[PDB]
Design a protein around this ligand. Structure first.
Ligand SMILES: [Mg+2]
Ligand SMILES: [Mg+2]
Ligand SMILES: [Mg+2]
Ligand SMILES: [Mg+2]
Ligand SMILES: [Mg+2]
Ligand SMILES: [Mg+2]
Ligand SMILES: [Mg+2]
Ligand SMILES: [Mg+2]
Ligand SMILES: [Mg+2]
Ligand SMILES: [Mg+2]
Ligand SMILES: [Mg+2]
Ligand SMILES: [Mg+2]
Ligand SMILES: [Mg+2]
Ligand SMILES: [Mg+2]
Ligand SMILES: [Mg+2]
Ligand SMILES: [Mg+2]
Ligand SMILES: [Mg+2]
Ligand SMILES: [Mg+2]
Ligand SMILES: [Mg+2]
Ligand SMILES: [Mg+2]
Ligand SMILES: [Mg+2]
Ligand SMILES: [Mg+2]
Ligand SMILES: [Mg+2]
Ligand SMILES: [Mg+2]
Ligand SMILES: [Mg+2]
Ligand SMILES: [Mg+2]
Ligand SMILES: [Mg+2]
Ligand SMILES: [Mg+2]
Ligand SMILES: [Mg+2]
Ligand SMILES: [Mg+2]
Ligand SMILES: [Mg+2]
Ligand SMILES: [Mg+2]
Ligand SMILES: [Mg+2]
Ligand SMILES: [Mg+2]
Ligand SMILES: [Mg+2]
Ligand SMILES: [Zn+2]
Lengths: 52, 86, 158, 50, 135, 122, 134
RNA sequence: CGCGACCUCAGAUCAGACGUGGCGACCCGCUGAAUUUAAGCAUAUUAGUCAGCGGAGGAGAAGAAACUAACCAGGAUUCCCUCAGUAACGGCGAGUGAACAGGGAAGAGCCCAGCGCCGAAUCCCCGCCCCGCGGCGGGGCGCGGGACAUGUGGCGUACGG
RNA sequence: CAUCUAAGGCUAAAUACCGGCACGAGACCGAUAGUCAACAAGUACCGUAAGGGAAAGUUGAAAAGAACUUUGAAGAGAGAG
RNA sequence: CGCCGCAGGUGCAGAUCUUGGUGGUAGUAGCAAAUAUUCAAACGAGAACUUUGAAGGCCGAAGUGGAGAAGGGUUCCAUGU
RNA sequence: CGACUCUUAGCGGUGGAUCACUCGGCUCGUGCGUCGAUGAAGAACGCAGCUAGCUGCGAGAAUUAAUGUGAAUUGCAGGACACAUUGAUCAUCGACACUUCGAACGCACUUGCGGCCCCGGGUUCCUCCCGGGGCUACGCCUGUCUGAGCGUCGCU
């Protein structure tokens, strides 16, 4: 049971990966390469009003 | 002769059934059980045999009283009261 | 056998360590259990400070740390005597008392009693009988201004 | 032997009653999983404990 | 002292364990006397004991026992503690004054062997490998 | 044609014993039919009569026990089977009275310095 | 999805409860939907199967509009036996074919004091649900 | 030369209670090796560990300083991080090895004996009456027994009273 | 000079938990694996005894588990279903 | 199941390897200690071996006889397969 | 020509690999954290209409009562069960019951034998026989009664 299941990542590296993931989610080529069927989406950084 | 010839002579029982633990380890000549140590108040039990301990531990028998204790604990060991009659 | 350059290592694994290995898989459960106990305790002492009694200002002992100030165990009897608080009434109103600590300087003594005066001024006292207030506090100060404090009471800064 | 105690005779009585075939209607029960008495004992083949 | 109970003084092993005489019991004779009083009167609770005399071959101690089920004990606070189930047979666990003296308990630099409650409590905490989730 | 404990409880001890005796005679005849062939109807009545014997005896035992509990109600010493059977350890516990009585010193401390309700402003 | 931490979603556990269920909850497991007319008459959707009520089979080999009366509720095999749902075996007799109650619809309810009470309770809880969600 | 009082003892199928034995993962008190490592081996190591014995509880033990410190001083116990593979121990070989300060989790303090004052103020048991049954309690009554001046109870415990 | 006041006693919380009761979960194993034991498993059986200790899951949706004829003393077959 | 990553109880001819199964040997060794069987009939599908009758034999009273102790535990006895 | 033998394939056997399945484990976590002289753990022997094992139970013996539920149980049979002059089954479980050993408790056991007090019968109350019931273990505390001592004393 003491197999060292867990790893610790640096906070700055974890914040780095969030910045990269957010930036990629604003490029239509990368989201289409994930296969998300964004062909009729009016704008890839899709923002909706706070009513939702 | 130590082999087959001597095997014919064994006809006197060393051990018998034990009134405690019900095993055939009650040495008749010593009046002592080799499994439970019956004339002793305390049960014979050794940590060098974990397999033997789990053969005769609590839960391997009937637990006539303990299974009712486990049932009664879930309600706080209530006595003297009955469900409300219909 | 050693091989080329390296450290001379002395691992303390000659003593059947595998029978005593403390895994920490219950660490997240322990944090949750401790957190729930804090929230339950804070609810139990409803308007009182959640952290507990106010602790005194204390200077760390050795020459490595004497430039630093932290929180002690309780206010000394000399502090309570010259601040005008009985040592048996202080514990009931939320003041920690340490009878075995003495004062060696008037600087630390005066800083701690000034702390006690400020706490006593900040203290809202509910009357023992809610219908009959004897000497506790004004009804306006405890109608809605009485809220449960979080964190240490007047945290000890440097 | 002919000479025996009551405790020993009672022990042999239980073993005699226990050594018998299973009933035929058991095979028709739902989810039986029992084919034949696996605890059958013969006097010559396997000796009793005592 | 305690003579090692081995047949013919034979302690089969390395010479450091060949000692048979000049060996000493880890608990005092007063603790032994309290143990024998408590074991005989299993329905009573040992409180303390004291020294009343000695000769060359015997030591005499008088042991104070309490009946935990007497009404004079149970109806009186400040002595109800002895009636609690956790206090049965203190003398067999070294919780009396005489028994406790042999455990190395105390405060300070002279009693580091028992930080944690006892010698075994200290030994476990020091010989246990804390293998965290994140190493 | 069965026997119910609900309507058995009105009966007196005398007719309860009579009803038990008739059931025991009936069962002994049913055991006779069992070993002499009998019929499937009489064989299946064996369990019904046996349950009826258990039913009558249960009402008899309950009535006697509840009469003894009423008899020893309020008396200093009761039979052990009439005392509570919580747990051996639970019976050795201090009762609610002596778990709640306190010394005069403890009473004086709480009379003089009772725990107060207070709040601290930020 | 399921948020109750004291309810298991383990497949092995769920099957174990199903196949080892006591008879009094095997009755709830062996429930059948009511017909469209019955679902309109009483505000209930389903009901546990009963000995003497009439159902019609909607799935399997015995599909049809035939209103056959139940003749047996064999809870151990989780099946029911229906009047004309039967098959002729080798020797010449006819034997009933077990059908799961989830594959029939109850056209007529065998009504009594207990069935009416359960029907009222189920309908009342449904009306409480719709008045909450309205 | 009997009758009493006390002391120390004994018997009872005396009235009323209590202990035993089991489980034993965790905990407490003892007892306690050798295989092993040291490339041999005896001190050492394994290890205060395995085995052995006893005693508990839902936790146990510990615990409110005959403490740490040497500082501008801290302040019961227990647990975690660190101190630290360090100070130190060791055929100073193989190997072994804490503590203080610091940061946190939790945090709670107290009681006797003794010295004294108070007409033993104290406690148990047995009956009678009432209120209640719930872990058997209260209130009262008894020129009713017993415990106790070879010391019960109240005040009071080093923080002084 | 500093520090405490031993040889009497109690005390919750944070802490431990491979036995027990009741639960939940899994980048685990999938019937020579995983507990010895998925099954009438500490069972059958072995040993005087202490003790040792297995093998062994799967018809089908439903028994609808082959009526009946025929050869043979039957096991077993040929048709039929 | 493919592709991108992730993680292993991840690859067998050997270990006089473990467990299970199967061959050649091989229709082979063998079914040879204590003198011995034969005729007729019955039952029966079937008779060297069962049963009955007739012979010839053996144990030869320290028995291959009649009973017990220990041990076995229903082996006792009828009927049937 | 065949036999035999070898190779390959089809089919049929022997065997149970592989794969798919899984009411089982293993591991981690959580909440509780409860045995016993009022007789535990464990053992033995019994208990079903047809029942050997497992399971459940204790001479009230595959269960009584109560409560909740509400028409079954089922391998076969039998029989209940207006489901409202009350109810199959199942579950829960708080009433009642709970054989013999076992700390095991009258003494002792590979057997068996006592004693005391009551009740019933043969006796026709006196104590013999039979049955039933309740007692009869060790240690220990408080009190009680009965005592012992050329122990210390007082009166005599
Ligand atoms: Mg030999
Ligand atoms: Mg012998
Ligand atoms: Mg033989
Ligand atoms: Mg050595
Ligand atoms: Mg006092
Ligand atoms: Mg008595
Ligand atoms: Mg060496
Ligand atoms: Mg070597
Ligand atoms: Mg060597
Ligand atoms: Mg050990
Ligand atoms: Mg014990
Ligand atoms: Mg404690
Ligand atoms: Mg303590
Ligand atoms: Mg102190
Ligand atoms: Mg470092
Ligand atoms: Mg060491
Ligand atoms: Mg904190
Ligand atoms: Mg005093
Ligand atoms: Mg396996
Ligand atoms: Mg397979
Ligand atoms: Mg054949
Ligand atoms: Mg591998
Ligand atoms: Mg392979
Ligand atoms: Mg291979
Ligand atoms: Mg190779
Ligand atoms: Mg041949
Ligand atoms: Mg031959
Ligand atoms: Mg001759
Ligand atoms: Mg003979
Ligand atoms: Mg015969
Ligand atoms: Mg071929
Ligand atoms: Mg093939
Ligand atoms: Mg019932
Ligand atoms: Mg004898
Ligand atoms: Mg005298
Ligand atoms: Zn035994």
């Amino acid at each position: 049971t003491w197999r060292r299941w867990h790893r610790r990542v640096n906070t700055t590296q974890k914040r780095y990966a969030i910045c990269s993931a957010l930036a990629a989610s604003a490029l239509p080529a990368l989201v289409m390469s994930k296969g998300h069927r964004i062909e009729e989406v009016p704008e890839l950084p899709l923002v909706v009003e706070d009513k939702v | 002769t130590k082999g087959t010839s001597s095997f014919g002579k064994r006809r006197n029982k060393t051990h018998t059934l034990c009134r405690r633990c019900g095993s055939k380890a009650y040495h008749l000549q010593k009046s002592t059980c080799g499994k439970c140590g019956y004339p002793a108040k305390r049960k014979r039990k050794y940590n060098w045999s974990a397999k033997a301990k789990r053969r005769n531990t609590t839960g391997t028998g009937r637990m006539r009283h303990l299974k009712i204790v486990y049932r009664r604990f879930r309600h706080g060991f209530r006595e003297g009261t009955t469900p409300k009659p219909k | 056998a050693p091989s080329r350059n390296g450290m001379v290592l002395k691992p303390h694994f000659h003593k059947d360590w595998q029978r005593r290995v403390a895994t920490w898989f219950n660490q997240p459960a322990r944090k949750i259990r401790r957190r729930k106990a804090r929230q339950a305790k804070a609810r139990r002492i409803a308007p009182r400070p959640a952290s507990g009694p106010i602790r005194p200002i204390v200077r760390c002992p050795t020459v490595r740390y004497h430039t630093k100030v932290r929180a002690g165990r309780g206010f000394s009897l000399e502090e309570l005597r010259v601040a005008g608080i009985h040592k048996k009434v202080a514990r009931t109103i939320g003041i920690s008392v340490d009878p075995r600590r003495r004062n060696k300087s008037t600087e630390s003594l005066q800083a701690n009693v000034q702390r006690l005066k400020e706490y006593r001024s900040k203290l809202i006292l509910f009357p023992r009988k809610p219908s009959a207030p004897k000497k506790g506090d004004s009804s306006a100060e405890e109608l809605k201004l009485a809220t449960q404090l979080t964190g240490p009471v007047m945290p000890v800064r440097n | 032997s002919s000479h025996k105690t009551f405790r020993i005779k009672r022990f042999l009585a239980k073993k005699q009653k226990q050594n018998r075939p299973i009933p035929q209607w058991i095979r028709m029960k739902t989810g039986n999983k029992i084919r034949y008495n696996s605890k059958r004992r013969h006097w010559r083949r396997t000796k009793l404990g005592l | 002292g305690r003579k090692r109970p081995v047949p013919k003084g034979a302690t089969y092993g390395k010479p450091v364990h060949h000692g048979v005489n000049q060996l000493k019991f880890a608990r005092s004779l007063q603790s032994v006397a309290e143990e024998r009083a408590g074991r005989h009167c299993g329905a009573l609770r040992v409180l303390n004991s004291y020294w009343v005399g000695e000769d060359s071959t015997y030591k005499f101690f008088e042991v104070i026992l309490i009946d935990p089920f007497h009404k004079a004990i149970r109806r009186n606070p400040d002595t109800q503690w002895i009636t609690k189930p956790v206090h049965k047979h203190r003398e067999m666990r070294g919780l009396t004054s005489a028994g406790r003296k042999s455990r190395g308990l105390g405060k300070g630099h002279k009693f580091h062997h028992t930080i944690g409650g006892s010698r075994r409590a200290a030994w476990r905490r020091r010989n246990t490998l804390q293998l965290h989730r994140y190493r | 044609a069965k026997i119910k404990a609900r309507d058995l409880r009105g009966k007196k001890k005398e007719e309860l014993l009579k009803q038990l005796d008739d059931l025991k005679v009936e069962l002994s005849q049913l055991r006779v039919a069992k070993v002499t062939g009998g019929a499937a109807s009489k064989l299946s009545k064996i369990r019904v009569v046996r349950k009826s014997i258990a039913r009558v005896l249960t009402v008899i035992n309950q009535t006697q026990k509840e009469n003894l509990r009423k008899f020893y109600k309020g008396k200093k010493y009761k039979p052990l089977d009439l005392r509570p059977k919580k747990t051996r350890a639970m019976r050795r516990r201090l009762n609610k009275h002596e778990e709640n009585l306190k010394t005069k010193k403890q009473q004086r401390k709480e009379r003089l310095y009772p725990l107060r309700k207070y709040a601290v402003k930020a | 999805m399921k948020f109750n931490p004291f309810v298991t979603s383990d497949r092995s556990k769920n099957r174990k409860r199903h196949f080892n269920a006591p008879s009094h909850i095997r009755r709830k497991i062996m429930s059948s939907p009511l017909s469209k007319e019955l679902r309109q008459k009483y505000n209930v959707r389903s009901m546990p199967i009963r000995k003497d009520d009439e159902v019609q089979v909607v799935r399997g080999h015995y599909k049809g509009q035939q209103i056959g009366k139940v003749v047996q509720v064999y809870r151990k095999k989780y099946v029911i036996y229906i009047e004309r749902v039967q098959r002729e075996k080798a020797n010449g007799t006819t034997v009933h074919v077990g059908i799961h109650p989830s594959k029939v619809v109850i056209t007529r309810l065998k009504l009594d004091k207990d069935r009416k009470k359960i029907l009222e309770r189920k309908a009342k809880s449904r009306q409480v649900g719709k008045e909450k969600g309205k």
